[PDB]
Design an enzyme around this catalytic site. Structure first.
Site, PDB file in Angstrom:
ATOM      1  N   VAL A   7       0.834  -1.202   0.000  1.00 15.21           N
ATOM      2  CA  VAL A   7       0.000   0.000   0.000  1.00 15.21           C
ATOM      3  C   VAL A   7       0.884   1.273   0.000  1.00 15.21           C
ATOM      4  CG1 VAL A   7      -2.369   0.492   0.733  1.00 15.21           C
ATOM      5  CG2 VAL A   7      -1.156  -1.400   1.805  1.00 15.21           C
ATOM      6  N   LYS A  19      -2.786  -0.148  -3.073  1.00 17.85           N
ATOM      7  CA  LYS A  19      -2.198  -1.486  -2.929  1.00 17.85           C
ATOM      8  C   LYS A  19      -1.956  -2.089  -4.313  1.00 17.85           C
ATOM      9  CE  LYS A  19      -2.439  -5.832  -0.354  1.00 17.85           C
ATOM     10  NZ  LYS A  19      -3.263  -6.845   0.384  1.00 17.85           N
ATOM     11  N   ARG A  94      -9.432  -4.820  13.378  1.00 21.35           N
ATOM     12  CA  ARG A  94      -8.273  -4.693  12.448  1.00 21.35           C
ATOM     13  C   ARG A  94      -8.649  -4.331  11.015  1.00 21.35           C
ATOM     14  NH1 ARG A  94      -8.741 -10.130  10.543  1.00 21.35           N
ATOM     15  NH2 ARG A  94      -9.449 -11.343  12.366  1.00 21.35           N
ATOM     16  N   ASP A 108     -11.262  -4.121   4.403  1.00 21.44           N
ATOM     17  CA  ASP A 108     -10.779  -5.487   4.146  1.00 21.44           C
ATOM     18  C   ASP A 108     -11.796  -6.318   3.377  1.00 21.44           C
ATOM     19  OD1 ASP A 108      -8.451  -7.597   5.034  1.00 21.44           O
ATOM     20  OD2 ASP A 108     -10.408  -8.577   5.227  1.00 21.44           O
TER      21      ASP A 108
HETATM   22  O1  LIG Z   1      -2.105   4.185   7.733  1.00 19.86           O
HETATM   23  C1  LIG Z   1      -2.894   5.116   7.622  1.00 19.86           C
HETATM   24  N1  LIG Z   1      -2.919   6.167   8.506  1.00 19.86           N
HETATM   25  C2  LIG Z   1      -1.793   6.400   9.372  1.00 19.86           C
HETATM   26  C3  LIG Z   1      -1.843   5.459  10.548  1.00 19.86           C
HETATM   27  N2  LIG Z   1      -1.008   6.049  11.612  1.00 19.86           N
HETATM   28  C4  LIG Z   1      -0.365   4.974  12.426  1.00 19.86           C
HETATM   29  C5  LIG Z   1       0.408   5.601  13.567  1.00 19.86           C
HETATM   30  O2  LIG Z   1      -0.468   6.477  14.272  1.00 19.86           O
HETATM   31  C6  LIG Z   1      -0.777   7.586  13.433  1.00 19.86           C
HETATM   32  C7  LIG Z   1      -1.750   7.072  12.401  1.00 19.86           C
HETATM   33  N3  LIG Z   1      -3.843   5.264   6.631  1.00 19.86           N
HETATM   34  C8  LIG Z   1      -4.249   4.207   5.840  1.00 19.86           C
HETATM   35  N4  LIG Z   1      -5.230   4.233   4.962  1.00 19.86           N
HETATM   36  C9  LIG Z   1      -5.357   3.005   4.360  1.00 19.86           C
HETATM   37  C10 LIG Z   1      -6.287   2.673   3.388  1.00 19.86           C
HETATM   38  C11 LIG Z   1      -6.252   1.383   2.906  1.00 19.86           C
HETATM   39  C12 LIG Z   1      -5.344   0.445   3.351  1.00 19.86           C
HETATM   40  S1  LIG Z   1      -5.325  -1.207   2.707  1.00 19.86           S
HETATM   41  C13 LIG Z   1      -6.721  -1.917   3.497  1.00 19.86           C
HETATM   42  N5  LIG Z   1      -7.896  -2.160   2.894  1.00 19.86           N
HETATM   43  N6  LIG Z   1      -8.651  -2.703   3.874  1.00 19.86           N
HETATM   44  C14 LIG Z   1      -7.940  -2.782   5.036  1.00 19.86           C
HETATM   45  C15 LIG Z   1      -8.304  -3.266   6.272  1.00 19.86           C
HETATM   46  C16 LIG Z   1      -7.306  -3.169   7.220  1.00 19.86           C
HETATM   47  C17 LIG Z   1      -6.072  -2.640   6.905  1.00 19.86           C
HETATM   48  C18 LIG Z   1      -5.031  -2.490   7.905  1.00 19.86           C
HETATM   49  C19 LIG Z   1      -4.894  -3.396   8.940  1.00 19.86           C
HETATM   50  C20 LIG Z   1      -3.913  -3.231   9.893  1.00 19.86           C
HETATM   51  C21 LIG Z   1      -3.060  -2.154   9.806  1.00 19.86           C
HETATM   52  F1  LIG Z   1      -2.098  -2.000  10.732  1.00 19.86           F
HETATM   53  C22 LIG Z   1      -3.179  -1.238   8.783  1.00 19.86           C
HETATM   54  C23 LIG Z   1      -4.168  -1.412   7.840  1.00 19.86           C
HETATM   55  N7  LIG Z   1      -5.766  -2.195   5.682  1.00 19.86           N
HETATM   56  N8  LIG Z   1      -6.743  -2.296   4.819  1.00 19.86           N
HETATM   57  C24 LIG Z   1      -4.413   0.758   4.313  1.00 19.86           C
HETATM   58  C25 LIG Z   1      -4.451   2.047   4.794  1.00 19.86           C
HETATM   59  S2  LIG Z   1      -3.416   2.713   5.991  1.00 19.86           S
END
Ligand SMILES: O=C(NCCN1CCOCC1)Nc1nc2ccc(Sc3nnc4ccc(-c5ccc(F)cc5)nn34)cc2s1
Length: 225
Positions: A7, A19, A94, A108
Protein backbone atom coordinates in the site's frame (compact mmCIF):
# COMPACT_ATOMS: atom_id res chain seq x y z
CA UNK A 1 -17.93 -1.38 -17.92
CA UNK A 2 -14.62 -1.10 -16.03
CA UNK A 3 -14.05 2.18 -17.91
CA UNK A 4 -16.09 4.31 -15.45
CA UNK A 5 -13.95 2.77 -12.66
CA UNK A 6 -10.76 4.21 -14.26
CA UNK A 7 0.00 0.00 0.00
CA UNK A 8 1.48 3.39 -1.12
CA UNK A 9 0.65 7.20 -0.92
CA UNK A 10 -0.96 9.36 -3.69
CA UNK A 11 -2.86 12.50 -4.81
CA UNK A 12 -6.11 12.54 -6.86
CA UNK A 13 -7.15 17.40 -4.29
CA UNK A 14 -7.86 14.08 -2.52
CA UNK A 15 -5.11 12.23 -0.56
CA UNK A 16 -5.04 8.47 -1.39
CA UNK A 17 -3.55 5.03 -0.66
CA UNK A 18 -2.69 2.29 -3.21
CA UNK A 19 -2.20 -1.49 -2.93
CA UNK A 20 -11.49 -11.04 -12.43
CA UNK A 21 -9.58 -7.92 -11.23
CA UNK A 22 -11.73 -5.73 -13.53
CA UNK A 23 -14.97 -7.55 -12.57
CA UNK A 24 -14.41 -7.03 -8.84
CA UNK A 25 -13.22 -3.51 -9.59
CA UNK A 26 -16.76 -2.82 -10.85
CA UNK A 27 -18.40 -4.71 -7.92
CA UNK A 28 -16.26 -2.97 -5.27
CA UNK A 29 -16.98 0.33 -7.06
CA UNK A 30 -20.80 0.24 -6.67
CA UNK A 31 -20.61 -0.19 -2.91
CA UNK A 32 -21.10 3.37 -1.78
CA UNK A 33 -21.81 3.92 1.97
CA UNK A 34 -20.16 6.37 4.41
CA UNK A 35 -19.29 3.49 6.81
CA UNK A 36 -17.87 1.37 4.02
CA UNK A 37 -14.40 1.99 2.53
CA UNK A 38 -14.60 3.47 -1.02
CA UNK A 39 -12.77 2.51 -4.21
CA UNK A 40 -11.68 5.87 -5.69
CA UNK A 41 -11.16 4.36 -9.13
CA UNK A 42 -6.55 3.08 -5.10
CA UNK A 43 -8.58 3.69 -1.92
CA UNK A 44 -9.04 6.95 0.05
CA UNK A 45 -6.34 7.66 2.63
CA UNK A 46 -7.59 7.00 6.18
CA UNK A 47 -5.75 9.52 8.37
CA UNK A 48 -6.18 7.50 11.54
CA UNK A 49 -5.62 4.00 10.07
CA UNK A 50 -7.07 0.85 11.62
CA UNK A 51 -9.71 0.89 14.39
CA UNK A 52 -7.80 -1.65 16.52
CA UNK A 53 -4.51 0.33 16.64
CA UNK A 54 -6.42 3.58 17.25
CA UNK A 55 -8.30 2.31 20.33
CA UNK A 56 -5.08 0.63 21.68
CA UNK A 57 -3.15 3.90 21.37
CA UNK A 58 -2.32 4.80 24.91
CA UNK A 59 -2.37 8.51 24.04
CA UNK A 60 -6.01 8.42 22.84
CA UNK A 61 -8.70 9.01 25.41
CA UNK A 62 -11.87 7.39 24.14
CA UNK A 63 -15.05 7.57 26.21
CA UNK A 64 -17.78 4.93 26.48
CA UNK A 65 -19.88 7.11 24.10
CA UNK A 66 -17.00 7.21 21.57
CA UNK A 67 -16.47 3.44 21.57
CA UNK A 68 -20.15 2.60 21.25
CA UNK A 69 -20.32 5.18 18.45
CA UNK A 70 -17.60 3.38 16.51
CA UNK A 71 -19.61 0.10 17.04
CA UNK A 72 -22.73 1.89 15.72
CA UNK A 73 -20.88 2.97 12.54
CA UNK A 74 -19.65 -0.57 11.90
CA UNK A 75 -23.23 -1.81 12.28
CA UNK A 76 -24.49 0.83 9.77
CA UNK A 77 -21.78 -0.23 7.32
CA UNK A 78 -22.69 -3.92 7.77
CA UNK A 79 -26.39 -3.19 7.48
CA UNK A 80 -25.61 -1.76 3.97
CA UNK A 81 -23.25 -4.62 3.02
CA UNK A 82 -25.84 -7.18 4.25
CA UNK A 83 -28.53 -5.37 2.13
CA UNK A 84 -26.35 -6.06 -0.92
CA UNK A 85 -26.28 -9.76 0.13
CA UNK A 86 -22.49 -9.64 0.63
CA UNK A 87 -20.87 -11.58 3.47
CA UNK A 88 -17.73 -10.01 4.90
CA UNK A 89 -16.07 -13.21 6.39
CA UNK A 90 -13.42 -11.19 8.29
CA UNK A 91 -15.19 -8.54 10.39
CA UNK A 92 -12.73 -7.49 13.14
CA UNK A 93 -11.57 -4.11 14.46
CA UNK A 94 -8.27 -4.69 12.45
CA UNK A 95 -10.40 -4.47 9.26
CA UNK A 96 -12.16 -1.21 10.02
CA UNK A 97 -10.65 2.20 9.28
CA UNK A 98 -10.95 5.69 10.67
CA UNK A 99 -10.72 8.91 8.68
CA UNK A 100 -9.86 12.51 9.59
CA UNK A 101 -13.49 12.97 10.82
CA UNK A 102 -13.32 9.77 12.95
CA UNK A 103 -15.77 8.12 10.60
CA UNK A 104 -15.42 4.35 10.66
CA UNK A 105 -15.26 2.60 7.33
CA UNK A 106 -15.64 -1.14 7.15
CA UNK A 107 -12.78 -2.32 4.95
CA UNK A 108 -10.78 -5.49 4.15
CA UNK A 109 -13.18 -6.54 1.41
CA UNK A 110 -12.93 -7.15 -2.36
CA UNK A 111 -9.53 -6.42 -3.92
CA UNK A 112 -8.19 -5.11 -0.57
CA UNK A 113 -9.08 -8.45 1.13
CA UNK A 114 -8.99 -18.41 9.27
CA UNK A 115 -9.94 -15.66 11.84
CA UNK A 116 -10.97 -18.39 14.26
CA UNK A 117 -11.48 -16.18 17.32
CA UNK A 118 -14.09 -14.06 15.37
CA UNK A 119 -15.88 -17.02 13.87
CA UNK A 120 -19.40 -18.22 14.72
CA UNK A 121 -19.54 -21.79 16.02
CA UNK A 122 -21.27 -23.18 12.93
CA UNK A 123 -18.42 -21.67 10.77
CA UNK A 124 -15.78 -23.29 12.94
CA UNK A 125 -17.58 -26.56 12.23
CA UNK A 126 -18.64 -26.16 8.55
CA UNK A 127 -16.18 -23.52 7.28
CA UNK A 128 -19.23 -21.78 5.74
CA UNK A 129 -19.94 -18.08 6.25
CA UNK A 130 -23.25 -16.22 6.30
CA UNK A 131 -24.59 -12.81 7.31
CA UNK A 132 -25.49 -14.46 10.65
CA UNK A 133 -21.87 -15.44 11.09
CA UNK A 134 -20.82 -11.76 10.41
CA UNK A 135 -23.23 -10.86 13.30
CA UNK A 136 -21.30 -13.19 15.65
CA UNK A 137 -18.09 -11.53 14.42
CA UNK A 138 -19.66 -8.19 15.00
CA UNK A 139 -20.29 -9.16 18.62
CA UNK A 140 -16.55 -9.91 19.03
CA UNK A 141 -15.70 -6.51 17.47
CA UNK A 142 -17.90 -4.76 20.07
CA UNK A 143 -15.96 -6.63 22.77
CA UNK A 144 -12.69 -5.39 21.12
CA UNK A 145 -14.08 -1.84 21.21
CA UNK A 146 -15.03 -2.03 24.92
CA UNK A 147 -11.62 -3.50 26.00
CA UNK A 148 -9.75 -0.96 23.85
CA UNK A 149 -8.38 -3.63 21.49
CA UNK A 150 -7.66 -6.55 23.82
CA UNK A 151 -7.17 -9.85 22.02
CA UNK A 152 -10.17 -12.13 22.49
CA UNK A 153 -9.87 -15.36 24.46
CA UNK A 154 -6.24 -14.56 25.53
CA UNK A 155 -5.41 -17.91 27.23
CA UNK A 156 -7.20 -19.89 24.49
CA UNK A 157 -5.10 -21.27 21.61
CA UNK A 158 -6.74 -20.77 18.16
CA UNK A 159 -7.32 -24.54 17.53
CA UNK A 160 -9.13 -25.18 20.83
CA UNK A 161 -11.74 -22.39 20.48
CA UNK A 162 -14.57 -24.62 19.27
CA UNK A 163 -14.08 -26.96 22.27
CA UNK A 164 -13.94 -23.91 24.60
CA UNK A 165 -17.17 -22.48 23.22
CA UNK A 166 -18.89 -25.88 23.34
CA UNK A 167 -18.29 -26.06 27.14
CA UNK A 168 -20.88 -23.24 27.48
CA UNK A 169 -18.62 -20.17 27.34
CA UNK A 170 -18.54 -16.65 25.83
CA UNK A 171 -16.24 -13.66 26.19
CA UNK A 172 -16.60 -12.04 29.58
CA UNK A 173 -18.11 -8.61 30.08
CA UNK A 174 -15.42 -5.87 29.74
CA UNK A 175 -15.06 -3.60 32.77
CA UNK A 176 -16.29 -0.56 30.79
CA UNK A 177 -19.06 -2.31 28.82
CA UNK A 178 -22.62 -1.21 29.77
CA UNK A 179 -24.93 -4.15 30.75
CA UNK A 180 -27.29 -3.56 27.78
CA UNK A 181 -24.38 -3.59 25.37
CA UNK A 182 -23.19 -6.94 26.82
CA UNK A 183 -26.69 -8.34 26.33
CA UNK A 184 -26.42 -7.25 22.71
CA UNK A 185 -23.09 -9.10 22.33
CA UNK A 186 -24.71 -12.21 23.94
CA UNK A 187 -27.48 -12.01 21.24
CA UNK A 188 -24.88 -11.73 18.45
CA UNK A 189 -23.41 -14.96 19.83
CA UNK A 190 -26.72 -16.80 20.03
CA UNK A 191 -26.05 -20.55 19.51
CA UNK A 192 -28.74 -20.67 16.78
CA UNK A 193 -27.70 -18.47 13.82
CA UNK A 194 -31.41 -17.62 12.95
CA UNK A 195 -31.98 -16.21 16.43
CA UNK A 196 -29.17 -13.65 16.15
CA UNK A 197 -30.21 -10.02 15.46
CA UNK A 198 -30.02 -8.61 11.95
CA UNK A 199 -27.67 -5.65 11.37
CA UNK A 200 -30.72 -3.42 11.04
CA UNK A 201 -31.80 -4.58 14.53
CA UNK A 202 -28.25 -3.96 15.83
CA UNK A 203 -28.17 -0.42 14.35
CA UNK A 204 -31.47 0.21 16.15
CA UNK A 205 -30.53 -1.29 19.56
CA UNK A 206 -27.05 0.23 19.62
CA UNK A 207 -28.23 3.75 18.58
CA UNK A 208 -30.56 3.79 21.62
CA UNK A 209 -27.74 2.63 23.98
CA UNK A 210 -25.42 5.24 22.44
CA UNK A 211 -27.92 8.11 23.02
CA UNK A 212 -27.98 7.49 26.81
CA UNK A 213 -24.28 8.47 27.13
CA UNK A 214 -22.83 12.01 27.25
CA UNK A 215 -19.06 11.47 26.97
CA UNK A 216 -18.26 11.45 30.67
CA UNK A 217 -16.86 7.89 31.06
CA UNK A 218 -13.21 7.43 30.12
CA UNK A 219 -12.28 3.92 29.13
CA UNK A 220 -8.93 2.70 30.36
CA UNK A 221 -6.70 -0.12 29.13
CA UNK A 222 -6.67 -3.36 31.15
CA UNK A 223 -3.32 -4.38 32.74
CA UNK A 224 -3.94 -8.13 32.20
CA UNK A 225 -4.36 -7.57 28.41
O1 LIG B 1 -2.11 4.18 7.73
C1 LIG B 1 -2.89 5.12 7.62
N1 LIG B 1 -2.92 6.17 8.51
C2 LIG B 1 -1.79 6.40 9.37
C3 LIG B 1 -1.84 5.46 10.55
N2 LIG B 1 -1.01 6.05 11.61
C4 LIG B 1 -0.37 4.97 12.43
C5 LIG B 1 0.41 5.60 13.57
O2 LIG B 1 -0.47 6.48 14.27
C6 LIG B 1 -0.78 7.59 13.43
C7 LIG B 1 -1.75 7.07 12.40
N3 LIG B 1 -3.84 5.26 6.63
C8 LIG B 1 -4.25 4.21 5.84
N4 LIG B 1 -5.23 4.23 4.96
C9 LIG B 1 -5.36 3.01 4.36
C10 LIG B 1 -6.29 2.67 3.39
C11 LIG B 1 -6.25 1.38 2.91
C12 LIG B 1 -5.34 0.44 3.35
S1 LIG B 1 -5.33 -1.21 2.71
C13 LIG B 1 -6.72 -1.92 3.50
N5 LIG B 1 -7.90 -2.16 2.89
N6 LIG B 1 -8.65 -2.70 3.87
C14 LIG B 1 -7.94 -2.78 5.04
C15 LIG B 1 -8.30 -3.27 6.27
C16 LIG B 1 -7.31 -3.17 7.22
C17 LIG B 1 -6.07 -2.64 6.91
C18 LIG B 1 -5.03 -2.49 7.90
C19 LIG B 1 -4.89 -3.40 8.94
C20 LIG B 1 -3.91 -3.23 9.89
C21 LIG B 1 -3.06 -2.15 9.81
F1 LIG B 1 -2.10 -2.00 10.73
C22 LIG B 1 -3.18 -1.24 8.78
C23 LIG B 1 -4.17 -1.41 7.84
N7 LIG B 1 -5.77 -2.19 5.68
N8 LIG B 1 -6.74 -2.30 4.82
C24 LIG B 1 -4.41 0.76 4.31
C25 LIG B 1 -4.45 2.05 4.79
S2 LIG B 1 -3.42 2.71 5.99
Amino acid sequence: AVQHVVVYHGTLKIHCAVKQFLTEGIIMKDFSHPNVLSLLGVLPYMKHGDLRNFIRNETHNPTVKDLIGFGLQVAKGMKFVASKKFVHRDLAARNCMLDEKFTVKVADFGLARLPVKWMALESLQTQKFTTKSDVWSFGVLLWELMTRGAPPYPDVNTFDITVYLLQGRRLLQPEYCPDPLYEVMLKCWHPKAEMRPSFSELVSRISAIFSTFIGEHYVHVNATY
